[PDB]
Amino acid sequence: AHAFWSTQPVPQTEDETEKIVFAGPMDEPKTVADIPEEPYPIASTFEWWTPNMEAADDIHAIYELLRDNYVEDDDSMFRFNYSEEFLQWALCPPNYIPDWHVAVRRKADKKLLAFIAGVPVTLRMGTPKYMKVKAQEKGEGEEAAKYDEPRHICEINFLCVHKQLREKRLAPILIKEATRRVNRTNVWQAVYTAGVLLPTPYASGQYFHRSLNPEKLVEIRFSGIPAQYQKFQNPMAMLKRNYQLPSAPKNSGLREMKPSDVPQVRRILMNYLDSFDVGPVFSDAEISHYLLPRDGVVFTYVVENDKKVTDFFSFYRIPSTVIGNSNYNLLNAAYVHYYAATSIPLHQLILDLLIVAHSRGFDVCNMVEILDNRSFVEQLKFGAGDGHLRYYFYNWAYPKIKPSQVALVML
Numbered sequence: 001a002h003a004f005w006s007t008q009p010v011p012q013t014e015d016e017t018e019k020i021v022f023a024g025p026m027d028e029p030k031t032v033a034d035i036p037e038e039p040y041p042i043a044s045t046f047e048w049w050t051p052n053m054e055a056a057d058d059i060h061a062i063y064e065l066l067r068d069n070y071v072e073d074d075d076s077m078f079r080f081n082y083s084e085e086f087l088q089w090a091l092c093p094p095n096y097i098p099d100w101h102v103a104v105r106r107k108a109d110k111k112l113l114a115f116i117a118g119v120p121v122t123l124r125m126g127t128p129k130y131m132k133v134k135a136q137e138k139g140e141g142e143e144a145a146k147y148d149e150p151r152h153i154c155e156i157n158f159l160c161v162h163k164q165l166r167e168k169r170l171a172p173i174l175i176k177e178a179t180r181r182v183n184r185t186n187v188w189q190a191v192y193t194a195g196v197l198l199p200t201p202y203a204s205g206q207y208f209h210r211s212l213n214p215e216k217l218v219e220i221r222f223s224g225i226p227a228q229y230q231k232f233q234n235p236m237a238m239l240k241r242n243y244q245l246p247s248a249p250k251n252s253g254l255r256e257m258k259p260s261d262v263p264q265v266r267r268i269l270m271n272y273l274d275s276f277d278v279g280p281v282f283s284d285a286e287i288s289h290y291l292l293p294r295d296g297v298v299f300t301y302v303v304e305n306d307k308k309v310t311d312f313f314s315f316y317r318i319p320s321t322v323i324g325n326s327n328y329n330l331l332n333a334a335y336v337h338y339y340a341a342t343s344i345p346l347h348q349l350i351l352d353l354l355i356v357a358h359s360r361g362f363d364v365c366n367m368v369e370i371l372d373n374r375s376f377v378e379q380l381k382f383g384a385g386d387g388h389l390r391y392y393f394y395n396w397a398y399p400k401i402k403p404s405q406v407a408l409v410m411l
C-alpha cells in the first residue's frame with residue numbers, strides 16, 4: 001500500500017512502533033564513501049537546482065511555489081502563505097547547509113516544479129522516561145541509554161510538488177535526493193511532521209485554535225456561530241464578547257526580548273525542555289536566531305524585573321490564503337512557539353500572548369497539543385480543530401509517546 005515508504009528505513013506499522021523498547025537506528029550502518037556523489041536520476045526534461053536562500057530572486061521563486069501549491073487545511077478552504085522573510089528565517093538558521101535546500105526545475109523554461117528543505121537540528125531523541133523504567137527491571141539499561149546524548153540531525157520541511165505535477169511520483173524522488181545530500185554530510189537521521197498519516201508516527205497531536213477576531217473568522221468560514229448564541233438577538237455580539245480580551249497585558253514586567261536576554265532565555269528554556277522525552281538543544285546563536293523578534297515573522301516577550309528574566313513566550317506568523325477567486329482575505333494566524341514560565345502560572349503567561357497577538361492584529365492563535373499546551377486550553381478558550389500533526393523520524397526506531405512528551409515546535 002506504500003510503494004515508496006515500504007522501501008525506507010522507518011517503522012512500517014503501528015504495532016511495530018508500539019513494541020519498540022529502545023531508541024536507535026534502523027538501517028544498515030554506512031559511511032559517506034558508501035553514498036553516491038552523483039545526484040539521484042531524474043527525467044531529462046528536469047534538473048536539480050540548489051536555490052541560494054539569501055538571493056532575492058531565488059527566495060521569490062520558492063515563495064511563489066509555496067503560496068500557490070503548499071499545505072491546505074483538511075477542508076481545502078485555506079492554504080499556507082509563508083512570507084519570503086519567514087522562509088529565509090526558517091531555512092537559514094546557524095550553520096545551515098545550503099546543499100540541503102533542494103529544488104526541481106523544468107529545463108526548458110526554468111519553471112520551479114518542486115522543493116524540499118532540510119536544516120540542522122540538535123535533538124534529544126534517546127529512549128523515553130516510561131521506557132527506561134521497564135528496561136531497568138529487565139536490567140538492559142545500557143542498550144536503553146546508548147543514544148541519550150543529543151544528536152546533530154536533519155529537520156525536513158517545505159516538501160512541495162506543483163499542483164500540475166501531482167501523483168507522478170516526484171515526491172519520492174525529492175526525498176531520496178535530500179536523503180543522499182544529508183547522508184553525504186555523515187548525518188543519518190531526520191525528524192519531520194505532517195498533517196497526513198504516513199508510516200509511522202512516534203507521536204500525534206490535535207491542533208487547537210483560539211479566536212481573536214471572531215467576526216473575520218466567521219466571514220472567511222474558519223468559524224461558525226455557536227448554536228447557543230444563535231438563540232439571541234445579536235449572536236455576533238455574544239460571540240465577540242466571549243472572545244474579548246484586554247487591549248494590553250496587566251502583567252507587569254513584559255517587554256520584547258532583546259539580544260542581552262539571550263543567555264537567560266536559553267537557560268530557562270533548556271531547563272524546561274529537558275523535562276520532555278524529545279526536544280531540541282539550542283546554542284546561544286540558535287536562541288538568538290529562533291527567538292529574537294523579527295518584524296512580521298517571530299514575536300517574543302520576556303517578563304523581566306530588575307534585569308532578571310523569569311519568563312518568556314514566543315509566537316510566529318503564518319497567514320493563510322483564503323482560497324477563492326478574487327478573495328484577498330487572509331487568515332492572519334499566530335502560532336504558539338517556545339515559552340517558559342517560572343514566576344507566573346503558564347495560563348497567565350499565555351493569556352499575555354493572546355493579548356499581544358490580538359493587539360498586533362492577529363485573527364486566531366493556533367497550536368498543537370505538545371509541551372504543556374493542553375494545560376491552558378479550557379480557561380483560555382482554545383478549541384480543538386479538525387487537523388492532527390503527526391511526528392516522524394527517518395532511520396530511527398522510537399517507542400510511541402504522547403504529544404505532551406514532545407518539545408520540538410516545527411514551523
Ligand SMILES: CCCCCCCCCCCCCC(=O)SCCNC(=O)CCNC(=O)[C@H](O)C(C)(C)COP(=O)(O)OP(=O)(O)OC[C@H]1O[C@@H](n2cnc3c(N)ncnc32)[C@H](O)[C@@H]1OP(=O)(O)O
Nearest residue numbers: 002003004005071158159160161166167169170171190394
Ligand atoms: C537522513 C536524511 C533523511 C531526510 C528525509 C527524511 C524523510 C522526509 C519525508 C518528507 C517530510 C516532509 C515534511 C513536510 O514538508 S509536510 C508538508 C507536505 N507538503 C504538502 O502537503 C504540500 C501540498 N502537497 C504536495 O505538495 C504534494 O501532495 C506532496 C509533495 C506532499 C506529495 O506529492 P504528490 O501528492 O504529487 O505524490 P507523489 O505521487 O509525488 O508521491 C506519493 C508518495 O508521497 C508520499 N507522501 C505524500 N505526502 C507526503 C508527505 N507530506 N510527506 C512524506 N511523504 C508523503 C505518499 O505517501 C506516497 O508514498 P507511498 O505511500 O506510495 O509510499
Ligand SMILES: Cc1nn(C)c(C)c1CCOc1cc(F)ccc1-c1ccc2n[nH]c(CN(C)C)c2c1
Nearest residue numbers: 071072073078079080195207320366367368410411
Ligand atoms: C489555519 C490553517 N491553514 N492551513 C493551511 C492549515 C493546514 C490550517 C490548520 C491548522 O494547522 C496547524 C495548526 C497548528 F497549530 C500547527 C500546525 C498546523 C499544520 C497542519 C498540517 C500541516 N502540514 N504541514 C505543515 C507544516 N509543517 C508543520 C510541517 C502543517 C501544519
Ligand SMILES: [Mg+2]
Nearest residue numbers: 167168169170
Ligand atoms: Mg508527483
